[PDB]
Amino acid sequence: LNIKTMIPGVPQIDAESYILIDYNSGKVLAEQNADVRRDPASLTKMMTSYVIGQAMKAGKFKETDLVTIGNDAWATGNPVFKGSSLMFLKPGMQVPVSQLIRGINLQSGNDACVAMADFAAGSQDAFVGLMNSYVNALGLKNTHFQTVHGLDADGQYSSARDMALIGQALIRDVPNEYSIYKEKEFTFNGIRQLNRNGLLWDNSLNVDGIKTGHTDKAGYNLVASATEGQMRLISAVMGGRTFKGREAESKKLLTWGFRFFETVNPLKVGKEFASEPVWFGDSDRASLGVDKDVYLTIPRGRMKDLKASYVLNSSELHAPLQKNQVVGTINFQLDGKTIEQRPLVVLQEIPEGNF
Numbered sequence: 001l002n003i004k005t006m007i008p009g010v011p012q013i014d015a016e017s018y019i020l021i022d023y024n025s026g027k028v029l030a031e032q033n034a035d036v037r038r039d040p041a042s043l044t045k046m047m048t049s050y051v052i053g054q055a056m057k058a059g060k061f062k063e064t065d066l067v068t069i070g071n072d073a074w075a076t077g078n079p080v081f082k083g084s085s086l087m088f089l090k091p092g093m094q095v096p097v098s099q100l101i102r103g104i105n106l107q108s109g110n111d112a113c114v115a116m117a118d119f120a121a122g123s124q125d126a127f128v129g130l131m132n133s134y135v136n137a138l139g140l141k142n143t144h145f146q147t148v149h150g151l152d153a154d155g156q157y158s159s160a161r162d163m164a165l166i167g168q169a170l171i172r173d174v175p176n177e178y179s180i181y182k183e184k185e186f187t188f189n190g191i192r193q194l195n196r197n198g199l200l201w202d203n204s205l206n207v208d209g210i211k212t213g214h215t216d217k218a219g220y221n222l223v224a225s226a227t228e229g230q231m232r233l234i235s236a237v238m239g240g241r242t243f244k245g246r247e248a249e250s251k252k253l254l255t256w257g258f259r260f261f262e263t264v265n266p267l268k269v270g271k272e273f274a275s276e277p278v279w280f281g282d283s284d285r286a287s288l289g290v291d292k293d294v295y296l297t298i299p300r301g302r303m304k305d306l307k308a309s310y311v312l313n314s315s316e317l318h319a320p321l322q323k324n325q326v327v328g329t330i331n332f333q334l335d336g337k338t339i340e341q342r343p344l345v346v347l348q349e350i351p352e353g354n355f
């Protein structure tokens with residue numbers, strides 16, 4: 001019992017805040033100061049990429065389309081860019097979207113962000129409006145953007161939790177955009193540029209994202225995501241305190257998560273979990289399940305011990321029953337205790353009887 005019910009100790013993490021979540025279940029595996037508002041620095045570009053990804057998903061433009069660079073995206077024409085990561089765009093260049101988005105995602109090019117913001121939304125301010133609209137849509141409680149890149153934004157902030165949630169949204173909602181993050185290099189204007197995410201080259205993990213950020217003000221920041229088998233984790237580490245820990249602290253969290261936790265998928269949408277009699281219907285019985293795939297994160301090795309059962313909201317089911325009508329709750333249990341609950345819904349509509 002003692003070894004089965006063990007709660008693992010969390011490694012010490014040399015950073016101001018962090019969080020470790022499961023991508024599929026959303027379970028928070030470990031956290032410290034995860035809601036404290038901090039300078040996001042280049043992590044802001046995750047939201048820039050999310051907006052671009054949404055626009056591309058919507059067919060607003062495609063990767064082959066040429067963007068004509070304007071004055072505001074001219075790297076050496078705007079001292080706000082001094083000492084920052086740049087693609088080195090000049091006005092009059094005609095650059096494919098594919099190249100600009102790799103400038104953003106791999107190189108953290110601040111100039112590329114401006115070029116894409118104007119192309120996608122007409123102005124930087126309108127683009128930032130979109131970024132903040134998605135902050136609202138994603139339910140983020142501790143995030144606000146002022147810039148398309150992270151620079152020159154005194155009232156901009158995010159948090160470890162919110163940055164992990166933006167990472168989750170990238171992978172979930174804009175998978176074609178997310179797929180770019182694992183690319184180790186791209187070439188622009190005859191120069192090869194390497195992805196800044198050093199973890200991509202760590203053989204011991206399968207890291208395929210997401211974004212790094214450093215300013216002297218924000219410290220060292222990293223949102224990472226890695227997979228092992230069925231399982232995908234996302235870590236966000238903000239205000240990393242040393243150069244030597246910039247990838248090491250995140251690696252500590254990810255490796256710890258895979259060692260102690262596992263993700264299970266006990267039920268898919270549309271598959272019967274339970275059946276109940278129904279009154280007044282065109283069928284004698286209601287087929288019951290979920291309207292969203294169930295993922296649970298549990299201690300590693302406890303999968304065989306997982307039990308499921310359900311409760312019903314009402315004594316009797318009466319037709320008409322709508323598809324996806326909520327009629328109860330599924331309880332998932334370990335060691336006799338409910339650890340997770342999901343809504344139990346009608347899978348196939350049952351109208352009133354017609355004879």
Ligand SMILES: *C(=O)[C@H]([C@@H](C)O)[C@H]1CC(SCCNC=N)=C(C(=O)O)N1
Binds near residue numbers: 043084085196213214
């Ligand atoms: C993001 O956090 C900044 C961006 C706002 O400029 C970039 C800069 C760097 S490293 C320094 C590059 N400048 C210099 N020659 C990073 C990084 O994550 O390493 N992010």
